[PDB]
Design a protein around this ligand. Sequence first.
Ligand SMILES: *OCCCCCCNc1c(NCCOCCO[C@H]2O[C@H](CO)[C@@H](O)[C@H](O)[C@@H]2O)c(=O)c1=O
Ligand SMILES: *OCCCCCCNc1c(NCCOCCO[C@H]2O[C@H](CO)[C@@H](O)[C@H](O)[C@@H]2O)c(=O)c1=O
Ligand SMILES: *OCCCCCCNc1c(NCCOCCO[C@H]2O[C@H](CO)[C@@H](O)[C@H](O)[C@@H]2O)c(=O)c1=O
Ligand SMILES: *OCCCCCCNc1c(NCCOCCO[C@H]2O[C@H](CO)[C@@H](O)[C@H](O)[C@@H]2O)c(=O)c1=O
Ligand SMILES: [Ca+2]
Ligand SMILES: [Ca+2]
Ligand SMILES: [Ca+2]
Ligand SMILES: [Ca+2]
Ligand SMILES: [Mn+2]
Ligand SMILES: [Mn+2]
Ligand SMILES: [Mn+2]
Ligand SMILES: [Mn+2]
Lengths: 232, 232, 232, 232
Amino acid sequence: ADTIVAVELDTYPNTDIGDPSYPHIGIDIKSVRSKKTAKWNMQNGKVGTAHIIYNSVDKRLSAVVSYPNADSATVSYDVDLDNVLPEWVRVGLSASTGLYKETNTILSWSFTSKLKSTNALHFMFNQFSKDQKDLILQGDATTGTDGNLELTRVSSNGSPQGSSVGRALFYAPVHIWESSAVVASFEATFTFLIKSPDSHPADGIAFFISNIDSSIPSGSTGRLLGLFPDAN
Amino acid sequence: ADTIVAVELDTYPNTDIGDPSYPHIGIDIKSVRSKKTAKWNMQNGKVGTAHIIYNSVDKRLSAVVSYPNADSATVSYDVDLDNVLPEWVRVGLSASTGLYKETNTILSWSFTSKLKSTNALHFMFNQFSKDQKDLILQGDATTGTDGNLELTRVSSNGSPQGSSVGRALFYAPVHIWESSAVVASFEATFTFLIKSPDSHPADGIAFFISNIDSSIPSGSTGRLLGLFPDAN
Amino acid sequence: ADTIVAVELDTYPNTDIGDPSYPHIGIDIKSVRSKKTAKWNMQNGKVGTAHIIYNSVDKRLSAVVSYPNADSATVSYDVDLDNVLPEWVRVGLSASTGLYKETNTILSWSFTSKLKSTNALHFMFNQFSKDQKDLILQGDATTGTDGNLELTRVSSNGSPQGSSVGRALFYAPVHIWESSAVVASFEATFTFLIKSPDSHPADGIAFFISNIDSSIPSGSTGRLLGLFPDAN
Amino acid sequence: ADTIVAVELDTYPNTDIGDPSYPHIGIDIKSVRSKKTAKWNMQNGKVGTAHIIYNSVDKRLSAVVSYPNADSATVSYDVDLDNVLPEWVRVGLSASTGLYKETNTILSWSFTSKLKSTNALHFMFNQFSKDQKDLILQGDATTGTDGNLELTRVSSNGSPQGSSVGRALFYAPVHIWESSAVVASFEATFTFLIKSPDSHPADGIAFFISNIDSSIPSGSTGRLLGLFPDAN
DNA sequence: GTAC
DNA sequence: GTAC
DNA sequence: GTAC
DNA sequence: GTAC
Ligand SMILES: *OCCCCCCNc1c(NCCOCCO[C@H]2O[C@H](CO)[C@@H](O)[C@H](O)[C@@H]2O)c(=O)c1=O
Ligand SMILES: *OCCCCCCNc1c(NCCOCCO[C@H]2O[C@H](CO)[C@@H](O)[C@H](O)[C@@H]2O)c(=O)c1=O
Ligand SMILES: *OCCCCCCNc1c(NCCOCCO[C@H]2O[C@H](CO)[C@@H](O)[C@H](O)[C@@H]2O)c(=O)c1=O
Ligand SMILES: *OCCCCCCNc1c(NCCOCCO[C@H]2O[C@H](CO)[C@@H](O)[C@H](O)[C@@H]2O)c(=O)c1=O
Ligand SMILES: [Ca+2]
Ligand SMILES: [Ca+2]
Ligand SMILES: [Ca+2]
Ligand SMILES: [Ca+2]
Ligand SMILES: [Mn+2]
Ligand SMILES: [Mn+2]
Ligand SMILES: [Mn+2]
Ligand SMILES: [Mn+2]
C-alpha cells in the first residue's frame, strides 16, 4: 500500500475506528486512526483556513484550523518524517463523503518546502482552472467551477453527492528530506468551504504527503477520507 | 515540431545560420536564427550568471549575462509570448557540443512565474542530486557530480566531449499566460561554468520554454543547441 | 525640495496643469505634469488594484490599474531612475482631496526590491493596525479603521472630507539602485477603494519613491496629491 | 533596561556566570545565563551558518549552527515570546571581545517574519555597503570592508581588537506577535567568520530581538556579548 | 584547553 | 460648476 | 448531536 | 581550421 502522512479535518465521528465523539482535526501517520486529535468547531457554509507546519529541527507536525472571529483548533505530534516518508514525495488534498455528505471545496492552496545547508519549492493557487496541468486530479476531483477545486462530486443543482472520493496532487515530486540537509522545512495553507444540506456533514478534507505514485485506495469513500485502504 | 522560446549563450559562431562572428547571447523565437543578439565576452573556466526576465505589461524578453568584475552583456526583444507559446509550458536548460566542445556545467538554477489578479510557482536549485525527481533529464544531461548539473558529457577527470546534447526540464508544467490575468511575469537565473581545452569552445547553453511534451530534436548536437530540428 | 517619482491614480482633471479631460493614470518624474498618462475608468465605490513594476535592464516604469471584470488601464515611460532618484529612498502611498473629495482607502500594500549580482527587501500589509510602527504616517493618514489605511480624512459614518492630504511611508530606507548591481528590480501592488457622494470625485492616490527625508509639501492638498510643492 | 531574547554563539567559557566549560550555543531569555545550551565545535577561520526559527503554534525557539562537512550543533527552548517581548521589536546581530578577541565578521544575514489569519517582512543582505541606511550600527560595528559587516573592531593590518562591542539592527520595527494572529513565525539565517590569532578566541556573536529603542548596555564588552548590563 |  |  |  |  501507499505511505501516507496527513492532517485530517474530520467532520464526522466514526467512534468504531477510534474517532472522538465530535468533529476533530488529527495527525494521521500511516493510519486513519489519528496519533493525535483536537476538537474542531466546524462551521457549516463558512470559509475556513488550515495551516500545516513541520521542520527537521523540532520534528513536530503541527496544524491550525480557523474561521474568522472564532477560536482556532490546533494539533501537534512529535514524529521524525525521515523514518516515515520516502525522500521524494507528492503533496496533495483529499476528501470524501459516505452515507452523509458535504461540499469539499478548496478555494486556495499554497505549499513551500526548503532544504538548507538552499533548495526551495513554492506553489500558490488562488484560482483553479478547467485544465490545470500542474495538478494531478484523482477520483471525483474537478477544477474550474467558480475557479475552485471541488474534491468530491457536486451535482448540477449544487448539492454534494454521497459515497464520493477525490484528491489533487501537485505535479512535481517534492524532496521532503535529505541526509546531508542541516535544516528541512515545509508549510501548507489551504482555504475550504464545507457545506451540507443534511443535519450531519461527512466525511472531511485532508492535506497529505505520500509516495510519488500514490493513488486513491479502492473503496476509501466515507471514513477512510480517500487516504487508507482500511481502518487499521 | 516543438515550439521553442530561448535565450542562447552561443559560444561558437556558425556564420551560415546568421550567428555574428563572435560569441554572443541571443533571443530565439521558434528559430536558431536569433531575432536579436549581443556580443558576449565568454570567460573560459570562469563561473558566469544569466538572468532572464519577461512581463505581460512590457511584453519584452530580456537577458543579462555577467562574470564577476567584468561588464555584462544584455539583449532584449519585444515579443508577445501569448501569441508564440501555448498557455502551459515546461521550462528548461539545454546545451550541446559538436566538432568543438566545452563543459556545460550548471551550478544553480532558479525560476519564478506569477499570474496576477495571484497564482505563483518558484523553484531554486543550489544543489543538484544524483536522482533528482523534480527534473526531467534528456540526452546526455546528468546530476550529482559535485552537486552540479552537467548538461553535456564530461569524462571522470572533467574533460568535455564532442557530439553531445543534453537538457534538464522542471517536472511541473508552468502556466505561462492566461487570457484573464492582469499581469503575468517570469524570471530565471542560472550560474554556469563553460571550460574548453580548444582554441574555440562550442556550442553553448540556452534557457528555454517549450510545449510540455518537448524532447531533444533528432540530430540537434552542435549549432542547434538541443532546441531546433534544423537551422530554418 | 524633495525628489519624487510617482504613479498617480488621478480622479480629477486639472486642465491648467496638463491633466487630460478624464480620470487618468500617470507617470510623474519630479513634476505633477505627468510625463505619460492613460485614460482610467475609475469605478466609484469599487475595490481596485494597482501594480507598478521597474527593472534596470529595460529602464521602463510601468503600471496597470484594474477592477474585477473590467478592462485594465496601463501606462509606461522609459526613464533611467539611476539618474533621477538618490541611491537610497523611501517608498510610500499619498492621497489628497481639495474642493471635491473621495475616500482614499488602502486595503492592502506590498513592495519588493532586489539588487542582483542578491540584496532583497519585501513587505506585505493585508491588515493595517492602529499603532503600526513600520509605517511613517504623514498629514491626515490614519490606520486601524476596519484594518484599512485611510490616507485622507473620513468621518465616523465613512464620509470623505475636502481639503485633506495624507501619506504612509515604509519605515526602512530602500536601496533602489547600486552602480555595481547587474540587475535591480522593484514591484509594488496596492488595493484601494475610492468612493464619493460628489458628481466629481477628487483628487487621487499615488504610489511614490522619494528622498528618505521626504515630507508632505506645504499646501499640497487637491491637485498636487501630497507630492509636489507647486504645479511646475 | 532593555528586553532581550537572543541566540548566542559563545566562543569563550565564563564558568563564573554559568557558561559550560566549552564553546557553546545558547538561548538567552532576558539573561546572559542561557536557559539552554549545546556544545559547539567552533572552527577558527572557517565560514559558519546559523539558522534560528520560532512559530506561535509550537512556541519553541530553536537554532542550528553548522560548518561545511561537520556535524551541526542545535539548541531549543520552549518559551512563549508573547509573554517576554513587546508586540513591536527590532532584530539585530551583536558581538563582543574582552581580554581575548576574535573577528566577528558577518558575511550574510536574512530574516523573515509573518503574521497570518497575512502580514510579512523579509530582508536579505548578501552584500553590506559603506553607508547602509537600512541598518542601525551601534558601538564598533562597521559595514563595507570586503562587503562584510564587522561587528567588532578590526585594525588596519586585519587583527581583531580586545574590549570591543558592536551591533547592527534592521531599521524597520518588526511586528513579532499580535493577539488576533492565528499563526506568527520568524526565521533568521546568518553566515559568520570568527578568526583569532590567539590560542583562545572570545567572546562570540548573537542574533537578538529587543525593544525597538534598544542600545548597547554600557560596559557590555567581553562575556556580556553587547546584550546585557550585568551577568545576572 | 592546558598546565600546575 | 462657474467665469470669460 | 439528539432521541430512545 | 580548411576550402574555394
Ligand atoms: O458532532 C456530533 C455529530 C454526530 C453525528 C452522529 C452520526 N450519526 C449517525 C451514525 N453513526 C454511525 C456512523 O456510521 C454510519 C454511517 O457510515 C457511513 O457513513 C459515514 C458518513 O458519510 C462514513 O464515515 C462511513 O464510512 C460510511 O460510509 C449513524 O448511523 C447515523 O445516522
Ligand atoms: O583552428 C580551430 C579554430 C577555428 C575554428 C573555425 C571557426 N570559424 C568558423 C566556422 N566554421 C564552420 C562551422 O562548422 C565547422 C564545424 O561544425 C561542427 O562543429 C561546430 C562546433 O561544435 C558545430 O556548431 C556544428 O554543428 C558542427 O557539429 C564558422 O562558421 C566560423 O565563423
Ligand atoms: O458641477 C460640479 C462638477 C464639475 C466640476 C468641474 C470640473 N471641471 C474642470 C475644472 N475645474 C477647475 C479646477 O479647479 C476647481 C477646484 O479646485 C480645487 O478643487 C480641486 C478638486 O479637489 C483640486 O484639484 C484643486 O487643487 C483645488 O483644491 C478643470 O480644470 C476641469 O476639467
Ligand atoms: O574550549 C576551552 C577553551 C578554554 C579557554 C579558557 C579560558 N582561559 C582563561 C581564563 N578564564 C577565566 C575567564 O575570565 C578571564 C578573562 O575575562 C575577560 O576576558 C574574557 C574574554 O574576552 C571576557 O569574557 C570577560 O568578560 C573579560 O573581559 C583566564 O583568565 C584565561 O587565560
Ligand atoms: Ca471520521
Ligand atoms: Ca553557434
Ligand atoms: Ca488632477
Ligand atoms: Ca561566554
Ligand atoms: Mn478522525
Ligand atoms: Mn547564435
Ligand atoms: Mn494628472
Ligand atoms: Mn554562554
